[PDB]
Design a protein around this nucleic acid. Structure first.
Ligand SMILES: Nc1ncnc2c1ncn2[C@@H]1O[C@H](COP(=O)(O)OP(=O)(O)O)[C@@H](O)[C@H]1O
Ligand code: BEF
Lengths: 89, 89, 89, 77, 486, 87, 89, 90, 88
DNA sequence: TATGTGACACGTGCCTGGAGACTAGGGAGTAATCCCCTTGGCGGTTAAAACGCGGGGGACAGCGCGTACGTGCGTTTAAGCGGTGCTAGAGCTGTCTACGACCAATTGAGCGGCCTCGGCACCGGG
DNA sequence: CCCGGTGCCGAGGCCGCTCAATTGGTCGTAGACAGCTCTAGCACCGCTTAAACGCACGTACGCGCTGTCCCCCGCGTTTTAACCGCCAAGGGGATTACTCCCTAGTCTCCAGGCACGTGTCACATA
């Protein structure tokens, strides 16, 4: 698959299907899904990294929705991206 | 229809012992879907403003630079460049 | 007191009761349209969003009162907060 | 009297969570009015979205879309 | 003999130096043009200035018939000299310089300029800026009969605001005084011809369509058209008392610092590295301290050849004129002169008109020991008379060759017994060669209306031979120096 | 551009009042801004409802969403009358 | 023409062309341009009505950009829609 | 004198900030993000107009905050409070 | 005075915003009295705002593969930031 | 203290998408031109910025107090967890029929350009 | 406050040129509409128990100012930079023709994870 060839865990084919099914444009380049999968993988890795550190500080082995809220608020870059984001818990 | 397996994989990669719950998994999936929708919409608006039918990697890179603030944009464009280079090679 | 502040900040439960908020939501919706039904998830989301907005407004008016060298908040503080925010309607 | 359903201890606890030490008397009525305005706006938007799809009942997705267009993103609903 | 007789018959108000034969022809042509009513342009060279002929014609017009108000527009550094000349040569004629602040201009108009037409109306000599500012306010009321615009190169562009301000004012007759008649193009020539003759030239497309054997026919056709309008009198053609002019372009090799900067490194930065890059690199870095003059002359720029020419001029015992396009290079030269100990006097835009007049008076004075006189290309490069200095050197060469020729011929005036020497500095293997080639093409166009030599460097014997000016009272191509012939 | 139409609708509401050239360009840019907002909202509303064809129902909903409460009630009344007159 | 049948001064054909050229959707209905031109006609007439009254107060026949800026601040509904804009001069 | 000067600047619309220093500041700021950049005059004009409008809005909010604090003279703490309440704290 | 050392360098570009300019800007908003640190505070705020808008405009210009920044890019950046300009 | 519980790792039949290859044609990268506009600086004046002063409006520190808000207890009203029962209404599917798009001609609409004019300038005073 | 003509300068009106709207006509794919399918939201009686309310109070606090004293504002100098005027070039905006390869789909193929029952075990209750 293209995911194993590009060294990315996220599915490149699934994102490519969503871009075409979403009808965002007439044609979609081959370099768009592989480029978009890397950005989504890095952002998801940084969120889970800061959220995992908050769980270790609270002596919690499992990440709870409360830990995700503390991670996006303590980080200035993640707070500006989400803006006014209210977690369920 | 969800990125649960990939989120769990990247979490085990960044934190082997930490295990994410179901609610936090759904929250992370919703966050990833929101980021993907925002990036796709920005790329579509950029392609329509320039009257370009095809969405290339440059559109995704510009959408990432515009949406993501701070060092997040630079890290994301670096990751995307590395991924597209590994895919083309 | 300060102990009551740390207890509510640590907890994440919904402070506003569900039945009065649901009654108020239904009464408000009766004005725009007639014979409408509501899903429990929609009412829960409305309650969560309203509670988050009220917490933000309370933080803002507390900051404004601290700026005015007063520990007790006044309606003029909320008025100034809504005026600076621009949400005054 | 449904607007009066939001009781005084509820507003007091909401202010305690936000960090308010002392609360006045008119704060209750002011917050009730602000909450009424906010709920009116959000419910108007959600009713619009529900009438677009020609549905009788309002779902959580319409409320999420209304909050998103109002600038507040909600996850988990 | 005959020149003294016609001088009294043409203009009796003129009392002083008798006009010569070229001035006789000039005043006769001006009188005939005034009688017929056709406006003309004086294209006399830098030497043999037509300002005396113009003031003689104005005095003749004041002598008989009407005594209407006359307005003269000239650069700032020129109006003082014009007033001095009209006061020295022509007596019993009132002349005021209408240059000052707002309140000063108002009080001068109230005192010396009667609102109604008076018999004794002082001739106003204003600059370009004050005239452009006051054409609508105070100048629109006064009816001006005869106007003289010196240095017609100011009105070269068709879209100058000064052209609009002058068109707003009512002129009965106009006069243009240009050292060089045309620039290396035809649009400005058509604009000048339309400003002086509105009925003759009306559209630029017609003049462009009108202007091997085919190229020889079109130039001969356009020549016969403007011949009655333009009058040209070369210096060497009429005046034989003045010594000949020699323009020698000395080439200096690129220094080590210049080569390193060029290798590290658009056109502006290349030119900055070409001419005096020391202070420019210092200001780009941000250092407050300045390197020594010896370190500068040893490291950067053509200052080595500059100092060679300086010691050659010191041995020859003649005043030198240096021209710099940039205030940075002007300040570099002034600082070098102050560090060496020689007296320095710089004419720049920051210098006021009174200080300019004082400095040019001290320089014309023989007792002054200020042999080094600094002049700008924009200001002071045209309109001033400096006959005490025989040798002139150009550190930089501008794009327009007309300004360079004017700056080189400023010193070459009438009455300069000492032979004039023109020196041009241009580094080889740079954009200076390109800009000199552009200026050469431009001067060739204005006239039509080697590599190894530029690579080599001038030696001490060559410097001595070029300093020796016994031939004016040397091969065409020498090692490190080339002379251009008109 | 809609310059001639802005001038015509101005004479209907104010026959004597005139409009400047700069004011005409601003009014033209204002109409283009509202046109892009209503077209963009209808496109996003079509994607959410999975409907490829846009109609007057989607435009009416986009008007009630973008325009305020008092301003939308008057726009929908005129929009409904134009459709019945056209059909 | 089609614009004369509905009675709208704005061109219904030009709006239909912009919707199809702008590729907002695959198919554009027949009632969409006639409905969209009616909304644009009322909003344009509403702003010119308020701007005309502002010019009438200043005793100026020609409407200047300063008069248009004063009209959007007075009306609440016009300011709610046009609050983020900044009119030049 | 102070009250009359408010009526003059509010009635007449003009570019208060000079064009050349603002242009130099814009070029200096843009030099950090990318080198060898060139700016159009209309772009600089729009930048200046937007900056002046934003500064006028910030000054209005600061004056409101100062009036709320029973002080006629504005202070940097008022500007900080306005920035923090507006949410643009960066 | 012969040395003329020190380029007599001009002040910083951020200092180009003069005190009377900030005073007039505050008067337009309705400020009666202005303090001392207000000038530096507004300088910093204006610098931050200009940095953000210029970064967005430079990104928009890099998207079009153009060297010169145009007015349309500034308008798009300002619209992205939540303030649209009319007449440009 | 301990337990058992829903959260977490796993084969398993699958089941609906990715990739493995021919294609073919219209979007994108690229060689060349032109002249619109931009970067730099010199010249001058001229309104604008800044350095120094006196002082009077104003920010700020402290006090007695007298209005209003925090805290604790018997109590009364409503949130809520459960349970039944009906049902309008949400949601998936074959359809067949009125509705959107290209294309050939068309014929009149407004954008490109020329000319005169007349609301609004400014004039410097009383 | 209005004053005579004055001087602009964008507005009125007209003209020609022509590419944008429109009507007559086929169609094959999007949609409104009868049916049902199984699921959720409507109300309420029954117990009750944590949650809400008002009287008492007494003590931290909001408000007016009293003195101060210092940090701003306005005006006479001047002194330093904008700015309009202007010469000349040249990087780069904007456009056309071209040809090249890559992105959309159809025949197909073989493995990914999605719905579901299961063994177990880290808190989180007790
Ligand atoms: N008629 C004259 N007799 C003597 N000297 C004259 C005469 N006319 C001009 N000059 C000399 O020429 C100079 C003034 O005119 P000049 O500078 O030559 O005019 P232009 O500006 O045309 O070059 C002075 O040196 C003056 O002595
Ligand atoms: F004609 Be100018 F006085 F050199």
């Amino acid at each position: 698959s293209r995911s194993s060839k590009a060294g990315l865990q996220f599915p490149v084919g699934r994102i490519a299907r969503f871009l075409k099914a979403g009808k965002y444009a007439e044609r979609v380049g081959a370099g768009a899904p592989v480029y978009l999968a890397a950005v989504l993988e890095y952002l998801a890795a940084e969120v889970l990294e800061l959220a995992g550190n908050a769980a270790r500080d609270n002596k919690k082995t499992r990440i709870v929705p409360r830990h995700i809220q503390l991670a996006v608020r303590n980080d200035e870059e993640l707070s500006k991206l989400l803006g006014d984001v209210t977690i369920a818990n | 229809e969800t990125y649960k397996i990939y989120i769990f994989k990247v979490l085990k990669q960044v934190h082997p012992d930490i295990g994410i719950s179901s609610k936090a998994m759904g929250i992370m999936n919703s966050f990833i879907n929101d980021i993907f929708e925002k990036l796709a919409g920005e790329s579509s608006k950029l392609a329509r403003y320039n009257k370009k039918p095809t969405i290339t990697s440059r559109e995704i890179q510009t959408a990432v630079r515009l949406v993501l603030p701070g060092e997040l944009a630079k890290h994301a464009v670096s990751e995307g460049t590395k991924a597209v280079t590994k895919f083309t090679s | 007191a300060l102990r009551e502040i740390r207890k509510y900040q640590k907890s994440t439960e919904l402070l506003i009761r569900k039945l009065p908020f649901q009654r108020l939501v239904r009464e408000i919706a009766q004005d725009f349209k007639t014979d409408l039904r509501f899903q429990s998830s929609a009412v829960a989301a409305l309650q969560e969003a309203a509670e988050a907005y009220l917490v933000g407004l309370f933080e803002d008016t507390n900051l404004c009162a601290i700026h005015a060298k007063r520990v007790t908040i006044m309606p003029k503080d909320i008025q100034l907060a809504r005026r600076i925010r621009g949400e005054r309607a | 009297d449904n607007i009066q359903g939001i009781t005084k201890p509820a507003i007091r606890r909401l202010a305690r969570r936000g960090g308010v030490k002392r609360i006045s008397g008119l704060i209750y009525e002011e917050t009730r009015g602000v909450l009424k305005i906010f709920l009116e706006n959000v419910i108007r938007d959600a009713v619009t979205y529900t009438e677009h799809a020609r549905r009788k009942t309002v779902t959580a997705m319409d409320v999420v879309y209304a909050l998103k267009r109002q600038g507040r993103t909600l996850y988990g609903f | 003999e005959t020149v003294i007789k016609l001088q009294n018959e043409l203009c009796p108000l003129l009392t002083g130096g008798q006009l010569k034969s070229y001035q006789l022809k000039g005043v006769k042509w001006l009188i005939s043009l005034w009688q017929n009513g056709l406006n003309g342009i004086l294209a006399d060279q830098m030497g043999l200035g037509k300002t005396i002929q113009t003031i003689g014609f104005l005095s003749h017009l004041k002598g008989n018939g009407l005594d209407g108000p006359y307005l003269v527009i000239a650069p700032l550094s020129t109006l003082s000299n014009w007033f001095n000349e009209i006061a020295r040569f022509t007596p019993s004629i009132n002349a005021i310089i209408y240059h000052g602040d707002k309140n000063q201009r108002d009080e001068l108009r109230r005192k010396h300029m009667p609102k109604t037409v008076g018999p004794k109306f002082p001739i106003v000599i204003t600059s370009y800026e004050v005239a452009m500012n006051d054409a609508k306010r105070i100048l629109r009321h006064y009816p001006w009969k005869y106007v003289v615009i010196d240095e017609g190169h100011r009105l070269k562009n068709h879209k100058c605001k000064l052209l609009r301000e002058l068109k707003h004012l009512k002129m009965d007759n106009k006069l243009l005084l240009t050292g060089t008649p045309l620039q290396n193009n035809l649009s400005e020539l058509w604009s000048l011809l339309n400003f002086i003759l509105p009925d003759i030239f009306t559209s630029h497309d017609e003049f462009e369509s009108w202007f091997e054997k085919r190229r020889a026919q079109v130039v001969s056709k356009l020549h016969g058209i403007l011949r009655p309008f333009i009058l040209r009198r070369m210096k060497c053609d009429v005046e034989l008392s003045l010594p000949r002019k020699k323009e020698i372009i000395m080439y200096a090799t690129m220094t080590d610092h210049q080569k390193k900067f060029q290798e590290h490194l658009l056109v502006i930065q290349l030119r900055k590295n070409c001419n005096h890059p020391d202070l420019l690199q210092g200001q780009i870095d941000g250092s407050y301290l300045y390197p020594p003059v010896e370190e500068i002359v040893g490291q950067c720029g053509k200052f080595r050849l500059l100092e060679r020419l300086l010691v050659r001029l010191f041995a020859n015992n003649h005043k030198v004129l240096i021209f710099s396009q940039w205030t940075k290079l002007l300040d570099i030269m002034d600082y070098y002169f102050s560090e060496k100990g020689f007296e320095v006097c710089r004419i720049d835009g920051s210098v006021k008109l009174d200080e300019r007049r004082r400095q040019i008076k001290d320089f014309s004075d023989e007792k002054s020991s200020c042999s080094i006189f600094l002049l700008s290309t924009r200001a002071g490069g045209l309109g001033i008379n400096l006959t005490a200095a025989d040798t002139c050197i150009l550190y930089d060469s501008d794009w327009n060759p007309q300004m360079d020729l004017q700056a080189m011929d400023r010193c070459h005036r009438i009455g300069q017994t000492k032979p004039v020497h023109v020196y041009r500095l241009s580094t080889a293997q740079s954009i200076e060669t390109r800009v000199l080639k552009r200026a050469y093409s431009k001067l060739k166009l204005e006239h039509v209306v080697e590599d190894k030599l530029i690579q080599t460097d001038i030696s001490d014997a060559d410097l001595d031979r070029l300093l020796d000016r016994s031939d004016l009272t040397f091969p065409v191509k020498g090692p490190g120096w080339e002379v251009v012939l008109p």
